[PDB]
Amino acid sequence: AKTMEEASKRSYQFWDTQPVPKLGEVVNTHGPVEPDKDNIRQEPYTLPQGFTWDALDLGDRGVLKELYTLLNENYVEDDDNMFRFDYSPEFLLWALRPPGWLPQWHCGVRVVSSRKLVGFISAIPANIHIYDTEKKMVEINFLCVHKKLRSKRVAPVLIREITRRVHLEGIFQAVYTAGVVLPKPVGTCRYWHRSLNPRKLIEVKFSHLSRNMTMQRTMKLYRLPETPKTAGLRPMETKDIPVVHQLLTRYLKQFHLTPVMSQEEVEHWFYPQENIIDTFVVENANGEVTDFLSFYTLPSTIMNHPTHKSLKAAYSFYNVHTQTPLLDLMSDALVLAKMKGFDVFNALDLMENKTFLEKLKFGIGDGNLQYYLYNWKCPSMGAEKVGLVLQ
Amino acid sequence: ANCFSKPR
Ligand SMILES: CC(C)(COP(=O)(O)OP(=O)(O)OC[C@H]1O[C@@H](n2cnc3c(N)ncnc32)[C@H](O)[C@@H]1OP(=O)(O)O)[C@@H](O)C(=O)NCCC(=O)NCCS
Ligand SMILES: *C(=O)CCCCCCCCCCCCC
A151 lines ligand 1 (CB under 6 A): yes
Ligand that comes closest to the CA of residue A373? 2
**Angstroms from A223 CA to nearest CA on chain B:** 18
Alpha-carbon distance values, A61 to A36, A89, A256, A276 (Å): 37, 9, 39, 17
**Cα A271 from Cα A31, distance rounded (Å):** 34
A134: containing domain: 1-391
**Cα A150 from Cα A288, distance rounded (Å):** 53
Candidate from A177, A191, A365 with C-beta closest to B1: A177
Q: Residue A190: its chain B contacts at CB < 8 A?
A: 5
**Cα B7 from Cα A29, distance rounded (Å):** 37
- For ligand 1, pick from A3, A140, A143 the residue to mutate: most ligand atoms within 8 Å of CB: A143
A145 lines ligand 1 (CB under 6 A): yes
CB contact under 8 A, B5 and A367: yes
**Cα A31 from Cα A23, distance rounded (Å):** 17
Query: Ligand 2: which residue has its CA nearest to atom 13?
Result: A163
Solved using = X-ray
How many independent structural domains does chain A possess?
1
Q: Residue B3: its chain A contacts at CB < 8 A?
A: 76, 177-179, 191, 367-369
SS3 (DSSP) at B7: strand
| Cα A102 to averaged position of ligand 2 atoms, centre (Å) | 16
A145 lines ligand 2 (CB under 6 A): no
Sequence-ordered list of residues with C-beta below 8 angstroms from that of A297, at least 6 positions apart, any chain: A88, A91, A275, A276, A277, A278, A312, A313, A314, A315, A342
- For ligand 1, pick from A160, A161, A180 the residue to mutate: most ligand atoms within 8 Å of CB: A180
Omega of the bond prior to A184 within 30 degrees of 0, cis?
Answer: yes
Contact A296, A314 (CB under 8 A): yes
Helix/strand/coil (H/E/C) assignment for every residue in chain A: CCCHHHHCCCCCCCHHHCCCCCCCCCCCCCECCCCCCCCCCCCCCCCCCCEEEEECCCCCHHHHHHHHHHHHHHCCECCCCCEEECCCHHHHHHHHCCCCCCHHHEEEEEECCCCCEEEEEEEEEEEEEECCEEEEEEEEEEEEECHHHCCCCHHHHHHHHHHHHHHCCCCCCEEEEECCCCCCCCEEEEEEEEECCHHHHHHCCCCCCCCCCCHHHHHHHCCCCCCCCCCCEEECCHHHHHHHHHHHHHHHHHCCEEECCCHHHHHHHHCCECCCEEEEEEECCCCCEEEEEEEEECCEEECCCCCCCEECEEEECCCECCCCCHHHHHHHHHHHHHHCCCCEEEEECCCCHHHCCCCCCCEEEEEEEEEEEECCECCCCCHHHECCCCC
